[PDB]
Enzyme design. Structure first.
Site, PDB file in Angstrom:
ATOM      1  N   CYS A 150       5.381   7.526   9.727  1.00  0.00           N
ATOM      2  CA  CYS A 150       6.455   8.184   8.989  1.00  0.00           C
ATOM      3  C   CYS A 150       6.050   8.074   7.503  1.00  0.00           C
ATOM      4  O   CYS A 150       5.755   6.967   7.030  1.00  0.00           O
ATOM      5  CB  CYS A 150       7.804   7.507   9.242  1.00  0.00           C
ATOM      6  SG  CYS A 150       9.136   8.058   8.131  1.00  0.00           S
TER       7      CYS A 150
ATOM      8  N   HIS B  81       2.915   2.302   2.276  1.00  0.00           N
ATOM      9  CA  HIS B  81       3.059   2.785   3.641  1.00  0.00           C
ATOM     10  C   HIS B  81       4.298   2.126   4.264  1.00  0.00           C
ATOM     11  O   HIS B  81       4.617   0.989   3.917  1.00  0.00           O
ATOM     12  CB  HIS B  81       1.831   2.388   4.462  1.00  0.00           C
ATOM     13  CG  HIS B  81       0.639   3.249   4.177  1.00  0.00           C
ATOM     14  ND1 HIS B  81       0.471   4.464   4.801  1.00  0.00           N
ATOM     15  CD2 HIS B  81      -0.413   3.027   3.351  1.00  0.00           C
ATOM     16  CE1 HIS B  81      -0.655   4.965   4.317  1.00  0.00           C
ATOM     17  NE2 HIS B  81      -1.222   4.138   3.437  1.00  0.00           N
TER      18      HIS B  81
ATOM     19  N   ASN C 144       0.812  -1.230   0.000  1.00  0.00           N
ATOM     20  CA  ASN C 144       0.000   0.000   0.000  1.00  0.00           C
ATOM     21  C   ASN C 144       0.849   1.286   0.000  1.00  0.00           C
ATOM     22  O   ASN C 144       0.290   2.370   0.157  1.00  0.00           O
ATOM     23  CB  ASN C 144      -0.950   0.024   1.217  1.00  0.00           C
ATOM     24  CG  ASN C 144      -1.720  -1.259   1.455  1.00  0.00           C
ATOM     25  OD1 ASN C 144      -1.696  -1.830   2.546  1.00  0.00           O
ATOM     26  ND2 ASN C 144      -2.423  -1.741   0.441  1.00  0.00           N
TER      27      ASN C 144
END
Ligand SMILES: Cc1cc2nc[nH]c2cc1C
Ligand SMILES: Cc1cc2nc[nH]c2cc1C
Ligand SMILES: Cc1cc2nc[nH]c2cc1C
Ligand SMILES: Cc1cc2nc[nH]c2cc1C
Lengths: 269, 268
Positions: A227, A192, A190
């Site tokens: 982050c 991330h 994804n």
């Protein structure tokens, strides 16, 4: 891997790979953490939930809701050696409208002994606004049939390490590793940052002498903020203590926004 | 995994894991590279060599000699999807006193089709002085009984992509990713940076638009110098063209070259 006889937990075996081990020739805690998320993903696949790390239902997908990790607590007694077979059993349990809990037990396949255990707290969040909300009855009921009804805890102890509040590290930190940035291998499907990357970033500021003379026994990590792919992180550590204990803090390099806080406990080798 | 019937090659199956895939939901080239080194390590274990990534004999260990990768060339036709079973066959062959070659063939377990192939050149180096010493007859003879006698190549085509000389990228680079540092997970059991980390560092400077619209088909990487645990690297890329790129990894400070490579990408 497979669901157990009662269909309320999932088991899977793994053979520890050469690139998965550190200097001790045993699996790193980051390899362990990746295997925990892998067994968690296969448990969701086996019962019809999403397999993207969010374990959602069709109702949650329509509302743009996802499960996000709030806390990860891991305790290892023996890290499995290169070529050994480790067996991992995982299960979930609702904790009311607060969120859900996923637990794991790690065992040595040959001796049958418990070599590690882990627990994680998850909260429901709208993917777009990032706003948390208490779990609805409609969503809660969809999950209850895949969880044990009676409490089943990897950490049953009356006052255990998985439920202690973690304080905020105050400047100046005793140790630090500055300017840490994720690369494309740290991102999931994804795009991330993988939750395990933050474990590695926390451990980056442990001094080399501790790594050489001690073994990591416990790690508890709180996840406050994510982050981004273009963010830069600072990893801070201070000794709080035979055994050594450390308080940890991850924050954005610029403004000092907190992304994670944690503690580790190390035992002399 | 197991050695094949003739004992001259090794086969192993892998189920692609959720954390091993990228945005296409298929294995990354870094997962592939880690599986290649894993099957290579199990092949050495099965015949009595060291299992630390150096595949040494007791004679080499007494002389403080190790095998080091000089070149890695990988060509992927189809990256295996999450949950798929990929089968990898690997074998070695001496190339005289120059060094040895390890080859790999990747197959889809269900269809039996070849989904990828790889080749790597290895040289013998004294682990302390870092000096290349070229293969002796005593060492050569110890390995010959575990290799095919007739040439067996993953890349047989006369003058193919695996044997082309790679030029040095000239400043200014078209793209760059600066200040890359290895963390403890990038180190192997010997506290050296894992060879796969350099593949990731090379790809860090490919623009996002290329990653979104193209698939990586070929990567050739030369290894000149190693990055130490406390070194900082700069990753440089320039388009040379399908899309083709010339790559260079160098130490952030003095500009010492550690790697050079090329990648070929095909539109999705
Ligand atoms: C990074 C790191 C990972 C580990 N895994 C087990 N012990 C460990 C110690 C360190 C320092
Ligand atoms: C999200 C979730 C996924 C699961 N998979 C199996 N039981 C589960 C329970 C929950 C709550
Ligand atoms: C880092 C990276 C790894 C990959 N693996 C397959 N295609 C890829 C593309 C990129 C950019
Ligand atoms: C280094 C080496 C390791 C091997 N493992 C199996 N065959 C081999 C041949 C060589 C040359």
């Amino acid at each position: 891997g497979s669901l157990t006889e009662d269909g309320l937990s999932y088991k899977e075996k793994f053979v520890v790979r050469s690139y998965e081990v550190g200097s001790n020739k045993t699996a790193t805690v980051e390899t362990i953490a990746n295997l925990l998320q892998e067994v968690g993903c296969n448990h969701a696949q086996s019962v019809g939930f999403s397999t993207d790390g969010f374990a959602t239902t069709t109702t949650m997908r329509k509302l743009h809701l996802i499960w996000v990790t709030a806390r990860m607590h891991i305790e290892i007694y023996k890290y499995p050696a290169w070529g050994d077979v480790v067996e991992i059993e995982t299960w979930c349990q609702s904790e009311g409208r607060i969120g859900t809990r996923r637990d794991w037990i790690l065992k040595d396949s040959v001796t049958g002994e418990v070599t590690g255990r882990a627990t994680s707290k998850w909260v429901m969040m709208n993917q777009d606004t990032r706003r948390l909300q208490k779990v609805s009855d409609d969503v809660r009921d969809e999950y209850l049939v895949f969880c044990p009804q009676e409490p089943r805890l990897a950490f049953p102890e009356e006052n255990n390490r998985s439920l202690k509040k973690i304080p905020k590290l105050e400047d100046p930190a005793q140790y630090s590793m500055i300017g840490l940035k994720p690369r494309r291998a740290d991102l999931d499907m994804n795009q991330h940052v993988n939750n395990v990357t933050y474990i590695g970033w926390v451990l980056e500021s442990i001094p080399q002498e501790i790594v050489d003379t001690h073994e990591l026994q416990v790690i508890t990590l709180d996840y406050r903020r994510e982050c981004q792919q273009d963010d830069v992180v600072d990893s801070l550590t201070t000794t709080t203590s035979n055994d050594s204990q450390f308080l940890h803090l991850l924050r954005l390099s610029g403004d000092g926004q907190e992304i994670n806080r944690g503690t580790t406990l190390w035992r002399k080798k």
